[PDB]
Symmetry: C2
Subunit: 326 residues, 2 copies
Amino acid sequence: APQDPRNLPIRQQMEALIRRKQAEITQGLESIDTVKFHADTWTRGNDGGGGTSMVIQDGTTFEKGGVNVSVVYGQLSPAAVSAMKADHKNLRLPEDPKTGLPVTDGVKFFACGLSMVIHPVNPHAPTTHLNYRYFETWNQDGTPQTWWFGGGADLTPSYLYEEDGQLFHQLHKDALDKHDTALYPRFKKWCDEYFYITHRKETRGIGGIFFDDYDERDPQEILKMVEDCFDAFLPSYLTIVKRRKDMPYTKEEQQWQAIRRGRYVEFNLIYDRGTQFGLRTPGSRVESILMSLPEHASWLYNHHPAPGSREAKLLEVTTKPREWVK
Amino acid sequence: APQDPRNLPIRQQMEALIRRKQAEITQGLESIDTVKFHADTWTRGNDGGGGTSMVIQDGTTFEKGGVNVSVVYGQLSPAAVSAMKADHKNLRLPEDPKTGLPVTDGVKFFACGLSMVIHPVNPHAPTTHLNYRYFETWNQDGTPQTWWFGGGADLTPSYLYEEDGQLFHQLHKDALDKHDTALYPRFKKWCDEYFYITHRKETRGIGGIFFDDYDERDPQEILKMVEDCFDAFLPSYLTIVKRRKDMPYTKEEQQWQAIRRGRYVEFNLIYDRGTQFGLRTPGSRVESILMSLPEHASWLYNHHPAPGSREAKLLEVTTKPREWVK
């Protein structure tokens, strides 16, 4: 289940939206590689829900890539609450932990979303990430409480190309602008902040759009915005990878890709909430949650790119995020 | 400084000890290798203390290794706290403003310590971690609150060799048998518990000893214990490394070293308090803390060792720890 009729339409049409796009996206990535996505489907430990994971490995274009769909429901663990959304506080009960803790206990929840991470082989071809999800919570008596959408997509180059960042930001802007023109400077700036690797004083990439706890329209209207946002990814991502995958590259450009990949691990393991949520919801498939991580990464002690270099030019943008749109 | 007289001598002696070990341990590791440690001495942002970090890289025996000595003091931040100690609670504090928040704010700390992680080139040459430290706190009024010691050492093979585990545990058991025979079984199981990668259902290695929160004997006595432990290190690990450093290896054993390095990253960035503490203490040097990260790690999707393989043998010990002394 859950059967709760009040919002069940939106629940079923979001699941159906993300299953359609899982197919459509894998098919589209496959068209610029020579390898196919492999399926595996899992369940939480039953009546918990589960998902279908699609995975690509050892391609000619894509070294590793996952497009995971996840439909999950039941008891909301206290451990995982803070990583469910940005503002865990719309919610809350004082359910009194019997000796000495205050704040959290015995709630029912539902989440359904798509999660995607693609790492190309070629250092000139950027990593990317995309997510669209819907949450729902219910009061301990079984009554509605809130619901919300989240998502966005973002781009993680190791070598920067203005034309890539521009096209990526534009198409998602374009998509958001069909709904409300204030959405994209809003979700853009958010993307800039959310993927900040606090201890490194830099973002992992160059952003895109990011939103969470978004219940600000009819959920039907948020659904058509989600669909549109989905549609900005393939025309931007495919285009970008076609033009970078055959760019020439050196061992030193690989090294730097691996180092930024290390940056990517640090983000996903320390600050990423999707990851935290998943790792802390009972029964979840670790292999699926952790498909976000590259096949390889490196850490060097006290590395600084030679000055004026392209590597430094990435760090310029990653310490002070810039704009990419018109 | 701090010049607070009561426990000043211990603080200054712990320090004297850890710098002697830092020097002799690094000398030791340089001996079974043909590359030298690079020292650099850093400052926490002034009157916060500092540290002397020592990093070895790109040598014949050891791929990446650091020996960090760290003498640190000042304002204790809210966030640094849960990762100071196993059990923080022995410390306390409200102070209720207008309808608003009791818990804590301002109090003052001292930490001095040696931290170590060594990552050999050879997949058969195991990773090792070592830590001995002293921690102190003052009450809001400036009076002495607590001090304690935390520490120990553990072993992290990718390829299991029972003689290495026995040597390593034994020599550390001997160091503590000196002080009280009962500590070893206590600290040994502690080591099995702390290095568990909850989401992977397995420890990072085969452990050794770990203790935290320790003030059970008088500090003078603890310091001798801590110094006995130190000496258990080099005669195991150097003996252990001298004999695996030259075993032959395949690319596939190298891939398994890389996968087990990925597991180690997972532990460091999600569960390790020493890492948390440094990244959450203002002005601690990030490159010092995260030197514990392997130069290289890999993540493969849904990877399983073949039944009865050496690789699978690790996992038997890793998912269910065992004894190494008779």
